[PDB]
Symmetry: D2
Subunit: 306 residues, 4 copies
């Protein structure tokens, strides 16, 4: 079985991404990073999630409580005040581990050398800081699956997607490190990570433990997505990314390009792609261009059905 770490800013769809990761892979741990909502709450949400889903022995490690330069805002309008659509859930009794996420990533990369894969469904701060501490980590990590970036439809600024915007320095460091990277950008999630009202009716009538979990945590994500898309639905970028890592045929089309990240001015966080290979930098990532949404929906439905 393939071995993963999920690096998460735990709220809403990140929780479903962990759920899915715990079924498809040997989940060696969940590392926490600043992003979506208050960090302590993110940590609470991850521990509760792993407990609820019967994976109490997956360790949670605390990582950076800020991006490298400390410039971001939380998005409670998308995820709820608690990152769980204000579902007042029962306090978990699971606790985090002592080891820092940076130390854990570096350790797990030695123990599982050549096999470790990272599902990076958050700002890239922990991975960038691990790499700066020990650059030989690139020898040992098999693959990184990154949710982030946008071609043009920034969801946070006009141009920038949330993860890259929170920590563009981290994104830049990770992209030029020399990892094997596939990137799942926002536009691909918007189309292929989408659920419509009938998909919601169907999940809602499942009345399983995991289906009620899904409805409960993602209520605010659906409200927000419905507002911005102008049709009832929700968008699930981290679940899609985890599904693609597992089943690579969910990728219908992709390209190997040189991907850069703007650090400055109004365009801070922008994903800059040398589409025409005119600028003499070597390709550093596979960018997903089209994905199979039906196939994601069925993996998701199946996991909530169990």
């Amino acid at each position: 079985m393939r071995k993963v770490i999920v690096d998460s800013d735990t709220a809403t769809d990140d929780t479903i991404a962990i759920l899915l990761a715990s079924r498809f892979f040997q989940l060696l741990g969940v590392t926490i990073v600043a992003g979506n909502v208050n960090y302590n709450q993110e940590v609470k949400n991850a521990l509760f999630t792993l407990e609820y889903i019967g994976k109490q022995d997956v360790p949670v490690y605390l990582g950076s409580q800020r991006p490298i330069l400390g410039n971001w805002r939380t998005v409670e309008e998308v995820h709820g005040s608690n990152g769980m659509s204000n579902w007042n859930y029962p306090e978990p009794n699971k606790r985090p581990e002592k080891e820092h996420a940076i130390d854990a990533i570096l350790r797990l990369s030695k123990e599982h050398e050549g096999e470790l894969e990272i599902l990076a469904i958050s700002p890239l701060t922990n991975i960038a800081l691990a790499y700066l501490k020990d650059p030989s980590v690139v020898k040992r990590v098999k693959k990184i699956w990154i949710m982030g970036g946008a071609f043009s439809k920034g969801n946070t600024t006009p141009i920038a997607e949330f993860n890259f915007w929170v920590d563009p320095e981290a994104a830049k460091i990770v992209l030029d490190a020399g990892f094997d990277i596939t990137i799942v950008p926002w536009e691909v999630a918007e189309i292929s990570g989408s659920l419509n009202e009938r998909d919601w009716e169907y999940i809602s009538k499942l009345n399983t433990k995991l289906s009620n979990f899904f409805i409960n945590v993602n209520k605010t994500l659906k409200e927000y997505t419905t507002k911005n898309q102008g049709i009832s639905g929700s968008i699930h970028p981290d679940s899609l990314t985890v599904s693609i890592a597992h089943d690579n045929s969910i990728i219908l089309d992709s390209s190997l390009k040189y991907v850069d990240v703007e650090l400055c001015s109004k365009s801070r966080g922008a994903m800059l792609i040398d589409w025409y290979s005119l600028h003499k930098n070597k390709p550093n990532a596979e960018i997903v261009l089209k994905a199979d949404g039906g196939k994601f929906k069925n993996l998701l439905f199946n996991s909530l059905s169990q």
Copy 2:
């Protein structure tokens, strides 16, 4: 008949755009700006074009020989050394007018108040500088049709399109002046402004004065486009824009959005679009999202067969 000025950095497709404008509209003048190739050469290309096509009475006005900040390069690799695919064409008799483009635009905006339309198929320098000279011009201009910008597929930098990149300051000034603007971006021209090998075979067989002009002036544009697209053909952004101006049904989909232009850093020239309307500036341009390439092709074919 509708009344237009064409503002052009005259090379390759610009000349066909001028041809089309002169058939579809009352062409009140061609204003010349820095961009594609050496300025004095652009002037010659426009004077030659206007004589060759039987429009020798249309005046040519010299505008700015640099963008506002003077930061650009010419792109002889696309247009040829002379902006006409190295066709050594005969020197025309026609000379430019003495009146500066800026003074001509403002003067014509009063003579033709409420009717003057601008076909902006070049860096926006002359339009910006006329506005800074007399901001009341906004009240007298009916419409500006702009070829510029990219969503993601920058043709000059990884993110920036040529016209926007050459004079980003000018583009920002024009976009925020208060004109009624429609923008035709690079991705739309790449799809719906394109001609394939069978189209080129047809055009060469027409064997008219105009069809031979088209083949001669555009050879290098075909070579350049063929290399960068990986399939034989040529892309005609300025001709497509003029065609859209003429027949608005060529617009299949568009959206009124707030468009901003990055002035700084690696992303200078980038077209920033508030797609989800999250950022509190009201929309300022109709962005064309999909065009009818077949309808454009027929307009071009008709024009060249005269």
Copy 3:
């Protein structure tokens, strides 16, 4: 007698600079630009000053009501709401000319070719725009004296001085056009263009038409300076610049350097100087490094007394 135009964002010390210029030089005109206070108020201040000081036949030309990119704010906290320390002065009957400042600058550059000097005591918008309209103006202007920039002690941002901050694009354009340029920076004004409490004691006892004008127009500038310097007095950058132009021996030390202006990020407006000549752009301006404050004070007191 040397021939000058004063380009002014007319508030407080600008009016004293206009006074001195009219006594020291043949004052061919005053051009108005956006900057210190509301533009229409600046015009009224310039009209009033010229009438009050017996120079009613010096023409006032309206230039740009915004800097090139339109990004600034007025500083009523320094100059009073009306740019005259809230002196509700009587309406003058002098009117401005019809001719735009850009057109007047270019015309006067031809009528006074090789002699015309510009006293640039404001953001540099009008001069930059005249240059972009007709770059041959650099063959016709004898000299530009610029009040602008700071080494480190930004008076508007941490690093940027007001004039350069308001229109950094214009500053960059003017510095690279090829004029003969001397710059009086903020730190030199702060030291050598300052008046102390004993100086104000003296001026307020003179009881002349001009001394009463000085006291009335500069009251708020003294309040502001005293708050920001921690000791009673005022700073007179424009009057010092006009005085240096007149009597060059007031320059005690200066250097010919390559000077650049930052357009981007937190440092927007910063004056960048290649002090060690390490960067391969040839020098473009004389930077004043030390001035004779005593000689300035004596010139001011003499003028105010006569």
Copy 4:
């Protein structure tokens, strides 16, 4: 005795600063960071230095071999290709420690809680990365003495000083962390850290083991300073900073201000100081404005004359 770590990009004057530190303080360790010359050569220089000056037991820890963003260049023209003015010095026995500088800084911050001072005479990368790993380190570090920044006379770009230019991100991080910081900027070193021809004559005549080391290691620094300053001499910013830390009376004037670092554009690495307290961030550093060069020269001479 006061206890210090020296954080150094070891070449030329860093070696003398290490020497001074070893005499004035309990020197707990030298940490190495990328900057001045090739990183592996810097490690060799620190090892040789400590061995040669009789401090074999001072541990050397390898830190980051790049700034956070990996954007810099070495300056072999100032320090020589080996960072020791091409002195082919004999290879020492001493080898570095295994522990990473980041870990050692954090460890020594606990071991010497409330007493540890850092002599930060290089780009600030190791300190920033230690802080991001464990933000509580601020509670435990007593003081940081930073050599870095320029008011206007950038020695690397027109505005930026080398250390701040190499890692502006790290500088920003360190400045806002909440440490007790005194900064010694370039202009202060240039005046008060300077040695003239007579000082060099005196030092060569000392003919001690230490005086020969100084003359040998700093030859290229003298050659570079002499061409760029136009007077025979050398500049010793790191040795001045260590001297100031030791004898605080060497500070003749200083100011408590809010200090910022530019990360973008032509001004990247610029030190931005809120001189007038206009911008509502609380002060974060003591900035040295004038130093006692006479006192500095005697500490140096005493160090060399033994």
